[PDB]
Amino acid sequence: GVYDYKNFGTADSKALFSDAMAITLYSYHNLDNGFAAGYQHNGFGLGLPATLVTALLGGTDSQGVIPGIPWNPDSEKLALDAVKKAGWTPITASQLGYDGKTDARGTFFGEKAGYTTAQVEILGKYDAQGHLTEIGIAFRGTSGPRENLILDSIGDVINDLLAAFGPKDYAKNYVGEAFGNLLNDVVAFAKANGLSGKDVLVSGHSLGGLAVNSMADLSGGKWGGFFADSNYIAYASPTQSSTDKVLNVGYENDPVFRALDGSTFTGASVGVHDAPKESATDNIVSFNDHYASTAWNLLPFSILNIPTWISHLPTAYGDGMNRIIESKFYDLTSKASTIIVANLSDPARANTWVQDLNRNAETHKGSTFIIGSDSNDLIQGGSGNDYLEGRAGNDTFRDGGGYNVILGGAGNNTLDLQKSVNTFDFANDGAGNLYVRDANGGISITRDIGSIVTKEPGFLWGLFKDDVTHSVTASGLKVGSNVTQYDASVKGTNGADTLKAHAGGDWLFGLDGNDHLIGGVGNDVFVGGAGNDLMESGGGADTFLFNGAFGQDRVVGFTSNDKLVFLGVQGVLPNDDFRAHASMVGQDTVLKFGGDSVTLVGVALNSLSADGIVIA
């Protein structure tokens, strides 16, 4: 998964991420809440006020209205209830033995000149018996003194800030300067409660995220090395530490995210700065009204241009990346996966297709994950391989080709093929998968899509209608009661079956259990399913399709004109080809995808070509 961290598995890494997000949002105390609500209801026509940028960078004399920043009067309680719902309670000064200042929210403040407006939340997570089990440190970074955020233009302010982070280790030393003594008290408190460094989660967003990287960098030498083994997840940070400790999460179109290289100001800092970085998630797109709009994108992309900070806002971090976490596709992803997250206002969502525009970013490689919202989305996949997730709402999908998985989710969902139904083949395994194969051979596996919309240029049956709506049934595609019949198939059971294709060619659906699939002289598509399946070509131009936890399969009689298709399988890195997954065991080629494998019986590895092994 994209948020894998150290050596936690997929699941623990996800629980870790979800906690980092919760304590990070808590540190802002709903700063952007009224703004996010306004954008969601109305769109981004009014753009983004300079006052919001200065608030994000400099903090607030709170809590209440600020010009151009709509204020939710329940900002504070909403935020506190939320962090608690996530399992976290602020720890008091008194619990810490800390002699310094906390305000009425229980927030802690920086300790040295230049750092006194810096903020941090110290939170505890407790088991059902009320024993402390984890400590959360959520940095809320500031630039320093507020009156310095209006002395020049907002663009000068931003530009000067960035140029100041690297010289004299300003960004590196930040947490040591601001919170050096507080963090000593945290060590003592951790130890008295039987916690070590591994039980501490450190997070924060922005200058907060810059603080997370600072603390990582300081963790080896300060506080007796106690936090060296701590968990560091930083959101939308301009900087990256020189350790291997920090998971730097951000949107690729967030102009603050990765603005600096380490903490070094470069020629790209004020432009597009989308070079790959080891600690970073490089290719997560926030598909919001700005990213989507030609008008908003007229000016060159730059942090110095305030509208672009729309993609920096913390509410869309929490909302969008939680949907990644909840995704059915989550365990297919990895750190550099291209993930497009539906982040449009209610107005834009009605008429805008969520798609990878690849705007202001290096060329996206490998498969694309598009994650919808819980409302009605319009989702467009590209001509390569796509994983499209509708979630709730009535969603409409389009896709331009390749191999795809399309998950309608709850609701009444539609796949609009934009082409004649005569250019497609439809198969159905009776277990909720409808397969859609285009005229070039590209297969989509679809679930929970009840309508297919075709475009017929000629009259269908003499009967029907440029756009034509077919209803997906157990027995075929229905218009009223025209049938487009499913391709011929043989279906098994969830036990061990032998299935035999007819000479004409059959989709063979093994399903669960260890199946024996006997193709014939014709063109078969083999779907062994779960279990360890033995699949025999039997002649023809055959396709073998692997999805999910497909087991340990054996393929017999594979030739040049046959094709393997791996779609929604484990262990695939962007632009892996088959060689990355291939080895010889005896006279057999073996392809491994996580703990699943295909053995090509009697096939020499050197005899194979990438064109017959599709890795999506």
> 330 to 369, contacts with Ca ion by CB under 5 A?
361
Give the residue, chosen from 111, 177, 331, 386, that forms a contact with Ca ion under the rule CB under 5 A.
Answer: 386
Q: How far apart are CA 272 and CA 32, in angstroms?
A: 25
Give the residue, chosen from 531, 545, 568, 591, that forms a contact with Ca ion under the rule CB under 5 A.
Answer: 531
Examine residue 61 and tell whether it contacts Zn ion (CB under 5 A).
no
H or E segment at 529? none
Q: What is the DSSP string of 458-512?
A: SPGGGT--EEEEEEEETTEEEETTEEEPPPPEEE--SS--EEE--TT--EEE--S
Of 111 and 506, nearer to Ca ion (C-beta) is 506
**Among Zn ion, Ca ion, none, what does residue 129 contact (CB within 5–8 Å per kind)?**
Zn ion
Examine residue 128 and tell whether it contacts Zn ion (CB under 5 A).
no
What is the signed CA dihedral for 74, 80, 84, 90, rounded to 10 degrees?
A: -170
Give the residue, chosen from 7, 94, 129, 606, that forms a contact with Zn ion under the rule CB under 5 A.
Answer: 129
Of residues 457, 429, 423, the one with CA closest to residue 442:
423
**Among Ca ion, Zn ion, none, what does residue 131 contact (CB within 5–8 Å per kind)?**
Zn ion
Cβ 529 to Zn ion shortest distance, Å: 17
Of 194 and 220, nearer to Zn ion (C-beta) is 194
Give the residue, chosen from 134, 252, 389, 438, that forms a contact with Ca ion under the rule CB under 5 A.
Answer: 252
Q: Are strands 231-235 and 132-140 parallel, antiparallel or unpaired?
A: unpaired
H or E segment at 240? none
Give the residue, chosen from 473, 559, 575, 587, that forms a contact with Ca ion under the rule CB under 5 A.
Answer: 559
Of 206 and 537, nearer to Ca ion (C-beta) is 537
**Among Zn ion, Ca ion, none, what does residue 561 contact (CB within 5–8 Å per kind)?**
Ca ion
Q: How far apart are CA 327 and CA 347, in angstroms?
A: 24
Cβ 314 to Ca ion shortest distance, Å: 21
- Write phi, then psi, for 477 (nearest 5 degrees): -90, 115
Taking a C-beta distance cutoff of 8 angstroms, is the pair 153, 305 a contact? no
Examine residue 127 and tell whether it contacts Zn ion (CB under 5 A).
yes
Computed from CA positions of residues 102, 316, 340, 53, in that sequence, does the dihedral angle turn out positive or negative?
negative
Of 177 and 553, nearer to Ca ion (C-beta) is 553
Give the residue, chosen from 67, 94, 113, 131, that forms a contact with Zn ion under the rule CB under 5 A.
Answer: 131
Q: How far apart are CA 322 and CA 19, in angstroms?
A: 11
3 state SS for 267-303:
CCCCCCCCCCCCCECCCEEEECHHHHCCCCCCCCCCC
Of 127 and 611, nearer to Zn ion (C-beta) is 127
Task: Name every residue whose Cβ is closer than 8 Å to that of residue 335 and which is 6 or more positions away in sequence.
Answer: 2, 4, 280, 281, 282
Give the residue, chosen from 54, 102, 333, 404, that forms a contact with Ca ion under the rule CB under 5 A.
Answer: 404
Q: Are strands 466-473 and 451-456 parallel, antiparallel or unpaired?
A: antiparallel
Cβ 489 to Ca ion shortest distance, Å: 14
Give the residue, chosen from 17, 291, 544, 550, that forms a contact with Ca ion under the rule CB under 5 A.
Answer: 550
Computed from CA positions of residues 154, 158, 161, 167, in that sequence, does the dihedral angle turn out positive or negative?
negative
- Using the rule CB under 5 A, give the single segment among 8-16, 129-137, 293-301, 340-348 that binds Zn ion: 129-137
Of 134 and 217, nearer to Zn ion (C-beta) is 134
Query: Does 18 participate in catalysis according to the annotation?
Result: no
**What is the number of other CB atoms lying within 10 angstroms of the CB of residue 100?**
14
Tokens (6 digits) for 42: 């109305």
Examine residue 497 and tell whether it contacts Ca ion (CB under 5 A).
yes
Task: Say which of 13, 143, 203, 206 is annotated catalytic.
Answer: 206
Of 85 and 131, nearer to Zn ion (C-beta) is 131
- Using the rule CB under 5 A, give the single segment among 111-119, 154-162, 221-229, 245-253 that binds Ca ion: 245-253
Beta bridge partners of 139: 120, 204
- Write phi, then psi, for 442 (nearest 5 degrees): -70, 130
- Using the rule CB under 5 A, give the single segment among 312-320, 461-469, 539-547, 608-616 that binds Ca ion: 539-547
Residues making contact with Zn ion (CB under 5 A): 127, 129, 131
Active-site residue set: 206
Residues making contact with Ca ion (CB under 5 A): 252, 274, 282-283, 361, 372, 377, 381, 386, 390-391, 393, 395, 399, 402, 404, 408-409, 411, 413, 492, 497, 510-511, 513, 515, 519, 524, 528-529, 531, 533, 537-538, 540, 542, 550-551, 553, 559, 561-562
